[PDB]
Amino acid sequence: VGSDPVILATAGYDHTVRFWQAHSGICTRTVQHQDSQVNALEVTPDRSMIAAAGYQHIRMYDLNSNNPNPIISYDGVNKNIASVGFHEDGRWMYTGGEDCTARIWDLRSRNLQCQRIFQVNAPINCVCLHPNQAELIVGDQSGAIHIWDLKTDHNEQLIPEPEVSITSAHIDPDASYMAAVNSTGNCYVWNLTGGIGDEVTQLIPKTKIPAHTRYALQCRFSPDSTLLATCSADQTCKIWRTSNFSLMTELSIKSGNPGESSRGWMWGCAFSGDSQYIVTASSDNLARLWCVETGEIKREYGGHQKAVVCLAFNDSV
Amino acid sequence: ERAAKCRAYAKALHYKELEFQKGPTPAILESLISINNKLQQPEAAAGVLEYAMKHFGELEIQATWYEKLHEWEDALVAYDKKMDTNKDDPELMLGRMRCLEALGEWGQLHQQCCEKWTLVNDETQAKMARMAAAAAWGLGQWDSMEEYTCMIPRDTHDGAFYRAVLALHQDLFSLAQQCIDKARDLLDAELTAMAGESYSRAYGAMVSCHMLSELEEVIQYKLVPERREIIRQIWWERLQGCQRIVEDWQKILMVRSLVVSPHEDMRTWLKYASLCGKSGRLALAHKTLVLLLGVDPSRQLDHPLPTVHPQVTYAYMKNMWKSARKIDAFQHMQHFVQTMQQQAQHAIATEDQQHKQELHKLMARCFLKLGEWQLNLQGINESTIPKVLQYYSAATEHDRSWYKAWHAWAVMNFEAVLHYKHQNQARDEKKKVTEDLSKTLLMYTVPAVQGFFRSISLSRGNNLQDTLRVLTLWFDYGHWPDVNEALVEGVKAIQIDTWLQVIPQLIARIDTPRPLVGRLIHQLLTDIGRYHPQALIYPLTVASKSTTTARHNAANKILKNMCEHSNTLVQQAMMVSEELIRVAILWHEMWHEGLEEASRLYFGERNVKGMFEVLEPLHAMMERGPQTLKETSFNQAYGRDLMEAQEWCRKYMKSGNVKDLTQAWDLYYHVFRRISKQLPQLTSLELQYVSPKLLMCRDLELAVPGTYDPNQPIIRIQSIAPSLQVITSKQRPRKLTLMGSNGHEFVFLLKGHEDLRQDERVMQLFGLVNTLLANDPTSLRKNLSIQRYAVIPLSTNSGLIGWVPHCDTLHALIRDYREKKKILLNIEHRIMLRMAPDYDHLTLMQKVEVFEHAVNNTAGDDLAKLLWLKSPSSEVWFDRRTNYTRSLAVMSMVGYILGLGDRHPSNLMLDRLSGKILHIDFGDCFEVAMTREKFPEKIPFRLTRMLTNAMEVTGLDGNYRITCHTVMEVLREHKDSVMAVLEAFVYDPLLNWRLMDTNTALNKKAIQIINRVRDKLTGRDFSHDDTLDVPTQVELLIKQATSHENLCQCYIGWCPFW
Ligand SMILES: Nc1ncnc2c1ncn2[C@@H]1O[C@H](COP(=O)(O)OP(=O)(O)OP(O)(O)=S)[C@@H](O)[C@H]1O
């Protein structure tokens, strides 16, 4: 189930984390995750075990032992845990909480306690790790993005339009672009001055895409750095070109008549390794495999009783 | 027939609205402002235009919108912008002109008329004349008028009018006489021509009919010389009385201009200029004033002002202040007052006393501005304090009476005290210090106390504020002899009536440890006892049965003292309150709460020392013996078990076993089950079993709780109804009903376990707010008010609440409607949980989706609809709505300042006969609800979907928002009165307990709370640094009250979807 080349995980309000086989839509295994909805899923870079950030815990089920229950739990944090992220070298884990803290967890030791804590005023919605492993980007509900240097413990903050909550932030593998999306439905793109190694690492503003009218819920760069995906409460994942910042392909799930009242938000996405395909989490209980270029629904992962708010997607050798 | 004509309209509106519900069109929107206008509902229609603007910029031209919004000043500068960028455009000019004839800008209207006379358009030629006639009228030029009148058709009412004026000037009275009658008839036939769907031309008909009747009086003022007093009187009175917007009064005066020049009318035009300043039309007021002075728009700007007409100069000076030029304005004052005192002291040769007097009263008004302006320019500090205190004392000297001056002087002294006290908490934050402090504070305290006294006696009817202040100094100053003597002086001096306003505030400190303070309180209370006992018994009786010794002692003293003159009243009151407390929580009802609590401490907390403290007052409670059949019937079925369950407890007290203690709980759980079964059976109480003494009561001299007021004949408890419906609830309150000696019944709600003392102060606050609203003309024009109810505390446990007739809770009206229409009552809830079993733990974002999901699959009509179906007609329906919209908005703002939390759909109700709204349960005041740990309210007041929906469509833009400003504007004007009241019970000693609940010294917390309030009353509630004006603040609030992000977080019970 972690032995398959393709890991696809889907979690939500129905107390299960289901695993699917990408190419067929057959659900492989399903794991119990009771007492809470799942806020984030991320598979460890080691492909050993998957993390499930929830309400006051991060449970971590095993992808290798193909059966049991949480290997590790993390506790003693009040309010939700919204973001997870791992450091390449097996051992660190980062979190954003409603408790206003960005926390660094030691995966290779004991303690319900975490190695470090970076506190902000206003809850953190997203946490992502610059590919250089040296900086953490942290977006809060006030509308401040924080670059937190993991070495100097130096914090530096930047707010775009905000008095508005920033919902997610991401940064392309080649560390050339950083993007942040907020509750207005805007998408901000910055250029990355690669200071690094005796660091500076600066942000230079490039565009504000009017991505959506409604809430924008996630944003994400393809491995390519070719495209940028934007999921939203307008039941839409929009894929933008990085060369243009124009709309390449719109994926949407909105009725076909004004008298339907929606059914489903576009909660999250993940690109495939080759940037050819994109997975989609929605509140209509489905994950979906789209073709990035045609905007064609190539599959539909039906299973969850209740909503789906999470994906994790893995392609490594 | 007339009352029947509006009915069809109201009926058409309902449907016309229902249409708009399905699809908002410019078509409907047009036929909506019109029908709302025939229905003579101006502001509701103004709301339709707001929505018309924000959704269709489509009758276009931002200048056309400003013109329909009667904002002539914006439309004029927006038409200039539109003219200088565009071309000539014959329509843009007409609009540019209409702005001028509204503004009374005759200079620019006549110029614009002549200077642009190409006017190849013939319709542009027709309208052109009407305006340029009146323009020429204001500018004296009669030649121009005649020319432009010769172009107005005599068919129009307008054309017939300006002939009557041209004739009356040239002295052709028979011509003038006929033209009037023709102008009337051409207006009568025209009001039937546009039979309803017209402008403020139906309201401006009163302007033309007023002017025509006044123009006949101007006729009276030309040949037969005897009404020059009679005519000037009506002209004068039907002015202070009349309330017509600036623009209309211009025209009205222009009629009177034909006969009297402003220089003889003075008082008339000064009052008019006075109105122009108040309604923010300064540049016009100036021009009226310049005329009266007969001297420059002071183009000679460096020169002194002319003192020729002392009164006019004064106006000018304040116009200058209210204008931009206010250091200048301040400067001219100091100098004018100096000129004024010399013009008195010297030029007063005796045979001129009226002038001296009227000159001395003008100075008092000058001095008050002086101090007030000094404060505005500089603030309060070691340099200003003495200056303004001199300015105010000076004002006090020159008028002697005049509440304003004595008030101002009192508050300044009171704020000197505050300034140094708050400067000294500044010092102590980082012996000769305290001695100079004590000297300092005493120096301003004594005169403050003095000042507030003479000012109280100058209100009489309206002095709650000043009175409360007297008590602040009185209580706060642990009494230095000087400040005491000043108080005693005042207490003698001022009427006893006064203190009734403030009885709960006085009783709050009966047991004051400071010996000099208590003595005065005790004496003053006794004297209030002497005249108006009744006003005193209930609150004293409560106090006299109090755990704290010093209270009930001191309370009994005054009660004893009251027996020397009103003994049987004191006696009756004593008993009625005693019996009611017994009735409120019966013996078994206490044992039930006392057994729950006792099993939590023991079986769930291992606390036998606390547990023994729960049961021992219950055992000694019965130790006294039964006194009512209901007590004996309890004592039968339960007594022995308990009297022996205690026996086992007291075996363990000495043995220290655990098998001794388990025999007790064996017995205790027996009676618990027995009672618990009988509890849903209590749905009625009978006096003959529960309290016989109360049944016995006939024609007492005790007044019906909270009905006593002087002015009004005393209404006594003539009989108590024998049955009390028990409202089956969590606290099972009783519905007590009394028969009054006037005939009428009086229903109350006897509550057992809720300290009613807060609810009492809140009603006090409301009373004040009600006065304030009754006094503000607009708020009166609209009837704005809070419905209140009588609150009579009986102990810390219990008390009485006035039953409001014709009311049902929001929750009831809905429970009914939904069951009637076969909708599951709690459906939004069941939808939400089906979607998200873990709703409560979702991230904000997650919640908003689920919330929206629920909302989008359930109707929002209910309240709107059940209110339509209820109504017996459509005008009754329409009015009930107008009342509803307004009263809800009132309590939205007032509730906000109060910090009134917990407004779930069982805590507000709607009177079903007027539609006006009513708030109950004032437990959560000040931010409390929002500060709480579990489920903190994010909402400033409930402005929920079904409440919005029930107003007119175009809701919040219309009546609601307009009323919101009005109410708030009043609350800001009178921010001190409101704070006097609020300070009185945040710092109230026996009431501070409701903020230590932030756990689940107080000096510091209480400071916060009151600041948070001042912040709200000064528009500093949102950002620390901004100072938001009303409509901004209001908008910010409505926003906050409406946010899905805020609502979805609400504890589900609160029903954020109703
Ligand atoms: N001033 C009043 N006028 C008319 N009816 C009232 C008044 N106060 C309460 N009621 C009614 O009495 C019912 C009982 O509610 P409450 O008076 O609040 O007693 P309660 O049982 O303590 O309520 P809780 O604390 O919310 S369970 C309400 O549903 C109202 O209909």
Ligand SMILES: [Mg+2]
């Ligand atoms: Mg209640």
Ligand SMILES: [Mg+2]
């Ligand atoms: Mg209650």
